[PDB]
Amino acid sequence: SDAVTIRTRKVISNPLLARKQFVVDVLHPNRANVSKDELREKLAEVYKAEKDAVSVFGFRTQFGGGKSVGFGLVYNSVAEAKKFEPTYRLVRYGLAEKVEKASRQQRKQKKNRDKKIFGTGKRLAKKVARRNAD
Amino acid sequence: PRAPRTYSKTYSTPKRPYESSRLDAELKLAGEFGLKNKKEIYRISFQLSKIRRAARDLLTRDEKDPKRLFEGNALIRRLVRVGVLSEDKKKLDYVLALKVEDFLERRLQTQVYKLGLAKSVHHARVLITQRHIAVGKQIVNIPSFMVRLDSEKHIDFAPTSPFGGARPGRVARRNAARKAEASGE
Amino acid sequence: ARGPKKHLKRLAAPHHWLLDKLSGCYAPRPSAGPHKLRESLPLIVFLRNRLKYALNGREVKAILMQRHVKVDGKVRTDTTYPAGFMDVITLDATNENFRLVYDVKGRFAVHRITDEEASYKLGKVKKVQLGKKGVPYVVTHDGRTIRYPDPNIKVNDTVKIDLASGKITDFIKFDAGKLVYVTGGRNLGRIGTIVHKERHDGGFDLVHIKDSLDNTFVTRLNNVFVIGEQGKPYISLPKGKGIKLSIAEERDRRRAQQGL
Amino acid sequence: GFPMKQGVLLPTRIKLLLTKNVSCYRPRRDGERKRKSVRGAIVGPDLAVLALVIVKKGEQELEGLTDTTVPKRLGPKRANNIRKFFGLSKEDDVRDFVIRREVTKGEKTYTKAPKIQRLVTPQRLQRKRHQRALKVRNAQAQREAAAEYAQLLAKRLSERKAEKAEI
RNA sequence: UAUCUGGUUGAUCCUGCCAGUAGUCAUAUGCUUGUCUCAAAGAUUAAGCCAUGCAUGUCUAAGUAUAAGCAAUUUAUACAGUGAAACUGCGAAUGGCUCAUUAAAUCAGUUAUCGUUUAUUUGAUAGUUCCUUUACUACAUGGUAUAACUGUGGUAAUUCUAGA
RNA sequence: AUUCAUAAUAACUUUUCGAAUCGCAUGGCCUUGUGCUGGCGAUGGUUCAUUCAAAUUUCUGCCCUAUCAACUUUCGAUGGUAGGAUAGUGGCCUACCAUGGUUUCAACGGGUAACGGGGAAUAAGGGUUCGAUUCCGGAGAGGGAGCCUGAGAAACGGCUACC
Ligand SMILES: [Mg+2]
Ligand SMILES: [Mg+2]
Ligand SMILES: [Mg+2]
Ligand SMILES: [Mg+2]
Ligand SMILES: [Mg+2]
Ligand SMILES: [Mg+2]
Ligand SMILES: [Mg+2]
Ligand SMILES: [Mg+2]
Ligand SMILES: [Mg+2]
Ligand SMILES: [Mg+2]
Ligand SMILES: [Mg+2]
Ligand SMILES: [Mg+2]
Ligand SMILES: [Mg+2]
Ligand SMILES: [Mg+2]
Ligand SMILES: [Mg+2]
Ligand SMILES: [Mg+2]
Ligand SMILES: [Mg+2]
Ligand SMILES: [Mg+2]
Ligand SMILES: [Mg+2]
Ligand SMILES: [Mg+2]
């Protein structure tokens, strides 16, 4: 009961992306930039869809505080939410984990090392072993 | 290789460095309006010189010209809105006759002092820069906020300033804590 | 040098795209298509900047891969497809149609149209020739070749394409006293009737066009697109009707719109 | 380590501008030619390994040449190559005589067979008669379009010559 | 932002320069440097020379899959899923950097191709395939020849390559 | 505005093209043969248009210098004819022919601490100075030269040769 005053300006329906876009502006007195996860669950019962299909990003609160302005999305279902959500925001919403790949320089070094080998390279793998053995 | 970020100078140094008459009037206005540098006079003089030559080059055109009517009335409305040019004397001749004090009286540092609430121009500057004035529902820490005649009745204390409420203040809390430490619970 | 260019930077894009100076060093270069690079609106610019159905170009690709967008009855999943003048854009989702007509300010205007309007389009006859085996054909302003036309059609006329078949329905002839649309020049987006035209042997003929408010102007015929008879436009006109009033009267409608 | 080149009637090495589809060289770009030194075809004392291939088996038995046979790696992948391999006929079945290779995963036995190319399937016949019908219907559509335009030209000519006669 | 001042003489009025004076998205350097926004930055002398790492690769249901790869197939004993490698197609002629050349040259605005080429995109487009038929050659569909792959190697070395 | 588009006739060709390609669905029909016919596309493909262009091209405009006034034409300079080459016009090259072409309205030469422009600084007005550099066009990848593949490169994170 802090009068957080959730509202959504410039709401546009986008059945192209099977979602709804809006601008989430909140008015939180005596409190800073409260967080994104209670804004997601608040917008869940605002648009009556579900907690997991709500996507928000932005919320740069105004100078002097008290008011935060950001962008928000509500998806029709979680399946098409995952289909039209960027993977950096999946791990922001807990729906996925960071795919543990190599570093970008290490991936480029691996590609430039793999450019030398024509073919699989299994015959040269046994050839260098036979050359060093005998 | 992006688009270049536009910038420009907002002040002009006078051609003569040491004139006793000009140093008299600059430091008179600096102490009268509680200014920090002479740059805060040079910047206002830059805005006088730009709008004076705009009105000069538009008064060169004759009346009933669409360019003169459009640019003249837009500058007239802008100066009336900010409150520099008064409700009457809405002519480009009076825009040519504007002075430095007409912008110095419309600053937030001047206006906060003038509607009570500050007791001094220097106290008005330090209340603004220490975040004690919310003009609308937004706090301002710029002494040159240049109030535009629709916010004069709303120049008040901030809702999050200890003068305006919602907090007892940092040095009052420390002084109250020391009194409690020297007294009891 | 050395070949065709594939990058379009910002500050070299067409100005009617209204793209931001900031937020990137490049603009969507339109691919080859029915219209020229400088005189067409890419689908990413129409969706992300005009319709605002997308926040980034990645989701613009996502709708076009979902094949929701189609122009002229064809899907056109390419991101930078050069949709141009007199092109209908149909989204079967939301049941929403548009035509890329210009506005009074010379920019591509979001003008929603009905389905019986999206069932056809107008095309300015660029050239008439006999093809191979003596088959006459006309080429319109969007590169459409329509064989066996009605031989009353000359150049700088307009046909009405069925848009469901490579044929025509009816044609309207470049004559005096007909609604014309200005497609190029600084007079872009002005609607009026032909007062007269000049012969100008050697090239670059001129057309005198006056509005309904008697705002007479001249234009090269390369910029002139006939869009109906005297009155009665074959296309629903956008908001403004191509009158091009002065800016002082424009700021007066803003006060009138603000005055409630 | 310089390969001896076919057709170099010289006892030493020589640099040549080797191109695509020649020996001792594999290009990496389109139209790329590179100058490489190659040993001549004339056999001398400077060699290290000479390659011999036997074209006529003799009376004696070697340790590792004529005794051990290597199984064939890939069988015929095309249907006609299968038919000429097993000698069935011009028109028989290849699916019965597809070569099938056994893969054991330790516990699981599975069989793999090639995709048989260039066989006749009703999908291929459907596509073939589709282009037959495409060319036929295009020919009737253009002929009736030309006939309609010819009768439209005859109507315009009759109307304009009626107006020119009585004007 | 249409401004001048000091210096020749014992004193004056001039000519006249020197000196001051004010800006520079105009550079360097000295001293000083708390905050927020914004951001030029090896161009000038050496387009002088470069260690090293990276900057061009690319697969969808829709060209080729016997990886003796994975899940094993999903009438499925021809295959059907994914799929390294490699044939195949396309890109690599875009970009980024620099300004050494270059003085009707580039370039700028404006014209022409009735003086030409143009992959890709988009629109249209092909019942005639009859060698000299009064001699057609499988169309329920021709052929080989190779990569990747297996195996034998050479050289210290290279995105080198040979024989089967 | 054409010897234009297009058509016709006679022919000519180390005879061009005119689908032996792939995914998904597989409906309907009767001479019930796994027969007839058929759908939604993908990749291709000759030509004409289109777009992206490219190449050449018409007029006009560039700093200082005469202690640079004559220059070009052997090794094409100016034009004609004909050929060759080019993707195409053209001395672009060749052969023959004529002696032309530029110039004090500054040709030609020299210098540039010269890439051109959009622009920038200063400025009452008029001007002066700058513009290597966030955009457009050009040129180059140490200096030259030559070339392969490709629609397009005289490409240099392509090749070849010399230095
Ligand atoms: Mg506070
Ligand atoms: Mg002087
Ligand atoms: Mg701070
Ligand atoms: Mg330099
Ligand atoms: Mg260098
Ligand atoms: Mg480039
Ligand atoms: Mg960079
Ligand atoms: Mg640099
Ligand atoms: Mg291509
Ligand atoms: Mg010739
Ligand atoms: Mg010739
Ligand atoms: Mg000659
Ligand atoms: Mg320069
Ligand atoms: Mg230079
Ligand atoms: Mg420059
Ligand atoms: Mg180059
Ligand atoms: Mg290529
Ligand atoms: Mg080069
Ligand atoms: Mg490099
Ligand atoms: Mg390069």
UniProtKB/Swiss-Prot annotation, chain A:
UniProt feature, compositional bias: Basic residues: 104-114, 123-134
Broad class of the protein's primary localization: cytoplasm
Residues in the signal sequence: none
Domain of life: Eukaryota
Source organism of the structure: Saccharomyces cerevisiae (strain ATCC 204508 / S288c)
Source organism phylogeny: Eukaryota, Fungi, Dikarya, Ascomycota, Saccharomycotina
Protein name according to UniProt: Small ribosomal subunit protein eS24A
UniProt xrefs under PROSITE patterns: RIBOSOMAL_S24E
HAMAP family linked: Ribosomal_eS24 (MF_00545)
UniProtKB/Swiss-Prot annotation, chain B:
Entry-linked Gene3D superfamilies: RNA-binding S4 domain
Subcellular location(s) of the protein: Cytoplasm; Nucleus, Nucleolus
Short name of one Pfam family: S4
An example molecular function term from Gene Ontology annotations: structural constituent of ribosome
A GO CC annotation given for this chain: nucleolus
Note: Present with 106000 molecules/cell in log phase SD medium.
KW Ubl conjugation (keyword) present: yes
UniProt-listed PANTHER family: 30S 40S RIBOSOMAL PROTEIN, 40S RIBOSOMAL PROTEIN S9
Descriptive protein name: Small ribosomal subunit protein uS4A
Sequence segments annotated as region (Disordered): 159-185
Residue ranges of every copy of the S4 RNA-binding domain listed in the record: 106-180
Swiss-Prot record, chain C:
Lineage: superkingdom: Eukaryota
SMART domains tied to this protein: S4
Domain annotation S4 RNA-binding: ranges: 41-104
Xref: InterPro entries: KOW, Rib_uL2_dom2, Ribosomal_eS4, Ribosomal_eS4_C, Ribosomal_eS4_central_region, Ribosomal_eS4_central_sf, Ribosomal_eS4_KOW, Ribosomal_eS4_N
Crosslinked positions (Glycyl lysine isopeptide (Lys-Gly) (interchain with G-Cter in ubiquitin)): 61, 133, 160, 167, 173, 178, 210, 232
Protein name as catalogued: Small ribosomal subunit protein eS4A
GO MF term list: RNA binding; rRNA binding; structural constituent of ribosome
UniProt lineage: Eukaryota, Fungi, Dikarya, Ascomycota, Saccharomycotina
Subcellular location: Cytoplasm
Keywords tagged on the record: Cytoplasm, Isopeptide bond, Phosphoprotein, Ribonucleoprotein, Ribosomal protein, RNA-binding, rRNA-binding, Ubl conjugation
Miscellaneous comment in the UniProt entry for this protein: Present with 573 molecules/cell in log phase SD medium. There are 2 genes for eS4 in yeast.
SUPFAM superfamilies in the cross-refs: Alpha-L RNA-binding motif
Phosphoserine: residues carrying this PTM: 31, 246
Family from the record: Belongs to the eukaryotic ribosomal protein eS4 family.
Residues found modified as Phosphothreonine: 114
Subunit structure as annotated in this protein's UniProt entry: Component of the small ribosomal subunit (SSU). Mature yeast ribosomes consist of a small (40S) and a large (60S) subunit. The 40S small subunit contains 1 molecule of ribosomal RNA (18S rRNA) and 33 different proteins (encoded by 57 genes). The large 60S subunit contains 3 rRNA molecules (25S, 5.8S and 5S rRNA) and 46 different proteins (encoded by 81 genes).
From Swiss-Prot, chain D:
Residues modified as Phosphothreonine: 104
Protein location: Cytoplasm; Nucleus, Nucleolus
Quaternary structure (record): Component of the small ribosomal subunit (SSU). Mature yeast ribosomes consist of a small (40S) and a large (60S) subunit. The 40S small subunit contains 1 molecule of ribosomal RNA (18S rRNA) and 33 different proteins (encoded by 57 genes). The large 60S subunit contains 3 rRNA molecules (25S, 5.8S and 5S rRNA) and 46 different proteins (encoded by 81 genes). Interacts with snoRNA U3. uS11 interacts with MPP10. Component of the ribosomal small subunit (SSU) processome composed of at least 40 protein subunits and snoRNA U3.
GO CC aspect terms: 90S preribosome; cytosol; cytosolic small ribosomal subunit; nucleolus; nucleoplasm; small-subunit processome
Keyword tags: Cytoplasm, Isopeptide bond, Nucleus, Phosphoprotein, Ribonucleoprotein, Ribosomal protein, Ribosome biogenesis, rRNA processing, Ubl conjugation
Gene Ontology biological process: maturation of SSU-rRNA from tricistronic rRNA transcript (SSU-rRNA, 5.8S rRNA, LSU-rRNA); translation
UniProt-recorded name of the protein: Small ribosomal subunit protein eS6A
Note: Present with 66000 molecules/cell in log phase SD medium.
Family (UniProt): Belongs to the eukaryotic ribosomal protein eS6 family.
Top-level taxon of the source organism: Eukaryota
UniProt GO molecular function: structural constituent of ribosome
Cross-link (Glycyl lysine isopeptide (Lys-Gly) (interchain with G-Cter in ubiquitin)): 57, 72, 90, 155
